[PDB]
Write a protein that binds this ligand. Sequence first.
Ligand code: HEM
Ligand code: HEM
Ligand SMILES: CCCCCCCc1cc(O)c2ccccc2[n+]1[O-]
Ligand code: SF4
Ligand code: SF4
Ligand code: SF4
Ligand code: SF4
Ligand code: SF4
Ligand code: SF4
Ligand code: SF4
Ligand code: SF4
Lengths: 216, 289, 289
Amino acid sequence: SKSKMIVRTKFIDRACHWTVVICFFLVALSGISFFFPTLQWLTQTFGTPQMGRILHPFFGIAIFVALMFMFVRFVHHNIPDKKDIPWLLNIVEVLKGNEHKVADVGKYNAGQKMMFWSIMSMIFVLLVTGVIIWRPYFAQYFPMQVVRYSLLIHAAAGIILIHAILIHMYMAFWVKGSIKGMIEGKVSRRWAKKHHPRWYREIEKAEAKKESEEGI
Amino acid sequence: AMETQDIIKRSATNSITPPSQVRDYKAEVAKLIDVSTCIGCKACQVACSEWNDIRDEVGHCVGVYDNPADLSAKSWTVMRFSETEQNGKLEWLIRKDGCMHCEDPGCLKACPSAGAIIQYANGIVDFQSENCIGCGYCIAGCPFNIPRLNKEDNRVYKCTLCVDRVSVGQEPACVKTCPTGAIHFGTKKEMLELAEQRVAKLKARGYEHAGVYNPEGVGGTHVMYVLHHADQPELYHGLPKDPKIDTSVSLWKGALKPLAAAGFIATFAGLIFHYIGIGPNKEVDDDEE
Amino acid sequence: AMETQDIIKRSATNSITPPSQVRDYKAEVAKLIDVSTCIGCKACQVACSEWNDIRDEVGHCVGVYDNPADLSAKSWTVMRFSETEQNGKLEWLIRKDGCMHCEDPGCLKACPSAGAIIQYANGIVDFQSENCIGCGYCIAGCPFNIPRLNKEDNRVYKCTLCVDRVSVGQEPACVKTCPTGAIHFGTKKEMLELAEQRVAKLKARGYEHAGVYNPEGVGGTHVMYVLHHADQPELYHGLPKDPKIDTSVSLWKGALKPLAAAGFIATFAGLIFHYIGIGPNKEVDDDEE
Ligand code: HEM
Ligand code: HEM
Ligand SMILES: CCCCCCCc1cc(O)c2ccccc2[n+]1[O-]
Ligand code: SF4
Ligand code: SF4
Ligand code: SF4
Ligand code: SF4
Ligand code: SF4
Ligand code: SF4
Ligand code: SF4
Ligand code: SF4
């Protein structure tokens, strides 16, 4: 416990994450321009409206590829367990900045895991429905009725994921010190103690113990 | 755009900022295709392409007279042939296909690009290509499967109802060319009268289910048919029985939008008022006192 | 814009979003100026300005018949006179000058404003003034030194090939007016045939190097000449021998763009991945442990 910080995120998972974020800004904004045509300015997200129609789906595929790399590296830490119940019951208390007092928080809390599955499920929905409605390459192989349902579902899934990311960015801005961990990779031990007790307890034990195991 | 000042509907335009439409005191026009007088000559396909300066590719014969086999960016109208014994004797039902110029167009309703699809006061629904982004939403929104994308420019095209002839007082090219007068053109009101007279003569010849195809589901069409078997439109190479704008498309383009809007506004309010109300979540709010 | 749906090239438009061009099945047209039949009457200058509603200033005489002395925003075509004894006897070579309506226009290629310069399926290259920003890049991109800026509105103008007459079925004003029939007009295919017949008669009269000027460097032109001395076009008041789009302009408008794009994307990636990889450079990274 004699270091200002502890590593929370490896460089590879940090590089990926900020790649996703940049791709997501372009894809969400172009998507929103088709959804709300009154917001004319967003038709210039990829330069021109004609260009935006072409590039949206390609950047969409890139997000899904990078989210699948994230999926295989974080899924094991996002698994719901009986210890998450406490969180789910004192949500009102957590939102007032008192989660430590009410719950058992490991690597990622119960909100973060709900988000994780939400985000991962929506991107799968968006990938499937996106392919189905993609002209000129793929929509021609699908029955008109499936294309129509896909148009409805893709719009709805994209809106749900945008909401979700608005809340995800808010929380990251709100639980102070979090953005620095995602940019630089390190979290101060006290942040760990307050927001993620069980997690830091494990690092601290893994740490000390294996260095005690060496035989100083 | 809007030089004619008679634009009654415009794609992707908020309902509280309607397009210019002061010069709307004009009669609705309509084409009437009486399939009982059609001889399947394809003159209309030829006259349409000649007039419109378009040429499709030289295709193939795959066992039927139909050719081209479908509408395309280079073929705005196509003759569809059907051989059937469903009514008790051999019948060759031939129907001209192409845009129906719906009163309530699904293409226009599904389109996400402002001004790409417009509806004139006389009933013509036309594509304004400078605004088309090639998304293809209109292909799915159309109940009749009409719009076609041009691979060479990523824009959709279809029958314009010869808006360039009709706008200056002349009937469309396919209407004028039709050898047997199966295709008629005039005001919608007088085409509905001709339609009802023709139905009456077909009934007198034994076709008890003759009728006019002018679907109420899309608000009536400016391209109408007189059919010998109006109870069985699908016999005419799949013409839809009781077409309407799909329910999924209606909900996607309709209620989902304002609902999403409320969520977004509400969410932004909540998060903003939440941050201000409770304040940040820093490492120590406690050694601040 | 794009109402005619036959726009084959459009300035400052990405190659993967081409302009509307479904109605492209139209014959290419062309003007043929046979300078061996030209009498230097200037009727074409007068007919062009009368038709186009433009008037240049009353200029000055500086020793030659040429007047105005150059093309301008108010003079879209000008007669250029040359006196020479280069071929062994005194000859007065007179040539009508003005836009060549190139198949591969350099003006269009150099223009940085979307839609300011377009090329129609029939070969006409025309300026869409609502989009012109007055930069003048087209003046340098043109191999023939044609475009001219109007000081009163900061926009470039030139011969439109009487697009307003040709678009509705009439030949251009200067073509119709030419007293001796030095200027001819029709489809490009039949003007090339008339050109070759005229060359044959000029050779029969002793002009062994007569020829058609339809430069391959710009992909051929829709304004072509029949020249008595086709081996020496510069005798005709500097008409370029083997014109082409300048190499510097090709590289500036071509490869430099994507190269710059890659640099910028690559640079942004590098700097972003660099900051994240190594982290800030603060006064003490060391008392952080
Ligand atoms: C997973 C890969 C994705 C694919 C293949 C894809 C594909 C598409 C396609 C083809 C369209 C129609 C317009 C066009 O062609 O450009 C579209 C529209 C849209 N996309 Fe995606 N997209 C993907 C990801 C996303 C994501 C991540 C979001 C949310 C940020 C999103 C939100 C939207 C929205 C809101 C629309 C417009 C809905 C409307 O017009 O009402 N998409 N998508
Ligand atoms: C400016 C926008 C964003 C910010 C500031 C942000 C912030 C963060 C931070 C700080 C973390 C790590 C938190 C911790 O260490 O507990 C994180 C994790 C994560 N981010 Fe983002 N994020 C943004 C956008 C996105 C987007 C657009 C996506 C994908 C749609 C995304 C997907 C993820 C995922 C999957 C995780 C891991 C969480 C878990 O495993 O439960 N983020 N984000
Ligand atoms: C029922 C309300 C759900 C709340 C969702 C919690 C998601 C939550 C909570 C946090 O403290 C986070 C800190 C850093 C990065 C992401 C975070 N997310 O996603
Ligand atoms: S021109 Fe007339 S008769 Fe001939 S195929 Fe078309 S609708 Fe029938
Ligand atoms: S393809 Fe064109 S006309 Fe059709 S919906 Fe898209 S922008 Fe509208
Ligand atoms: S038939 Fe289709 S393309 Fe034509 S007006 Fe109706 S919905 Fe639009
Ligand atoms: S109304 Fe005109 S555009 Fe339509 S099928 Fe007839 S000729 Fe073609
Ligand atoms: S009108 Fe004809 S003859 Fe007269 S100067 Fe012009 S090209 Fe020559
Ligand atoms: S002066 Fe006008 S037409 Fe010429 S290059 Fe500039 S914007 Fe283009
Ligand atoms: S002569 Fe010049 S201005 Fe005319 S088309 Fe060719 S490049 Fe353009
Ligand atoms: S083709 Fe028309 S615009 Fe050109 S020089 Fe002749 S009169 Fe003038």
